[PDB]
Ligand binder design. Structure first.
Ligand SMILES: [Cl-]
Ligand SMILES: [Cl-]
Length: 101
């Protein structure tokens, strides 16, 4: 899908969008790594930080496969988004809602 792909948006810009108070815990967006890789940014919550954002670097295997953890890989970013919206499996929270605006 292209809806959760925000492209060349910076890390602080994605945080300002994800920190939106109407956003359900687990709101996300995929963007290009600021530092040719991609990044999954997810909104989270805890009492110390309150509303916050987690950033995961989406890496690629040399055999062609996207990954974030060590036991799961995908053929596309859409397959990765789909898997993580069903299971958190290592992520702070599972993907629940595509980031607004
Ligand atoms: Cl980055
Ligand atoms: Cl990073």
């Amino acid at each position: 899908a292209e809806e959760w792909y925000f492209g060349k948006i910076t890390r602080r810009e994605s945080e300002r969008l994800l920190l939106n108070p109407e956003n359900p815990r687990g709101t996300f967006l995929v963007r290009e790594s600021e530092t040719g890789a991609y990044c999954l940014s997810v909104s989270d919550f805890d009492n110390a930080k309150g509303l916050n954002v987690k950033h995961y670097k989406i890496r690629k295997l040399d055999s062609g496969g996207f990954y974030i953890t060590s036991r799961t890989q995908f053929s596309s970013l859409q397959q990765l988004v789909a898997y993580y919206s069903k299971h958190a499996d290592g992520l702070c929270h599972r993907l629940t809602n595509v980031c607004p605006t």
